[PDB]
Design a protein around this ligand. Sequence first.
Ligand SMILES: O=C(O)[C@H]1O[C@@H](O)[C@H](O)[C@@H](O)[C@H]1O
Ligand SMILES: [Ca+2]
Ligand SMILES: [Ca+2]
Ligand SMILES: [Cl-]
Length: 301
Amino acid sequence: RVFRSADVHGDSFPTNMAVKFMGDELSKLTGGKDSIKVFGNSALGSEKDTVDQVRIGAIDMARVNGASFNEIVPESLIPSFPFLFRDVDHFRKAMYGPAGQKILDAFAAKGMIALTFYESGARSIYAKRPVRTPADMKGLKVRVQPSDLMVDEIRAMGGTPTPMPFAEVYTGLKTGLVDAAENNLPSYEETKHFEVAPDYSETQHAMTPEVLVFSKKIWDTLSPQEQAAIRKAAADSVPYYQKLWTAREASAQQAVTKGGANILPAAQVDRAAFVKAMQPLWTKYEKTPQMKQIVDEIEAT
Ligand SMILES: O=C(O)[C@H]1O[C@@H](O)[C@H](O)[C@@H](O)[C@H]1O
Ligand SMILES: [Ca+2]
Ligand SMILES: [Ca+2]
Ligand SMILES: [Cl-]
């Protein structure tokens, strides 16, 4: 049947496109039994709300950021840890390997089947002034996702964190409720945040993944063959997503720069000042030997 899936991004965004592709692939594998419709633009609710809905079986699927599980699935904290991944190649090798699998596995006890990760580049601060160091962060009202870890990350960077839904951030910046936020370049572009917060400073403080989750209540009513079809379609969507995403990182950078944004490259940012300040959070959020082991498996990749 038609599975309903949520996304905060617009229809043309790579996450929406990848799950629509998954849906097309899935309909074939199931002899037309199944397809997916993606409701974008936060139509079904904030990310938080849609995760609640997936967990109770009110919607079938959601494509959400890892941060949105940080208070539900402890293992989801790990890939949001600051400066955990060395670069994108490290993210890919670790997150599509056994370490990433252990993180996906942890979702089942909380009513969700985590089918796949998608990469989300690196999140960086943007604002109305450049940011090279924490002193530069001091005084900024910085929107964060509603995650205790992300609140702590931005506080350690020196900003004053304020949680808000993604859809509300643009107006928050345009009207001065907040002075800053953080995200990857494609999101900075899509939302037009770059028009009102033109200084994008490559702090690259997190490389949090996206996660595609399926309601376990619904999943549990499916046959092993249907389940295997859905898992195959999700896996097959990843190289498709990666083609779109890598192109979008490049096009977003050019578009925001053409549109007046000033990107401060990572090399000019004192990752030094940010790394030593944020590291302790790893120890704070390592809540089990299992989490410690996952972090270790990631680092050893
Ligand atoms: O900051 C946000 O709220 C958003 O960040 C984006 O990178 C992510 O794709 C979204 O799912 C959402 O979490
Ligand atoms: Ca809640
Ligand atoms: Ca360790
Ligand atoms: Cl949201």
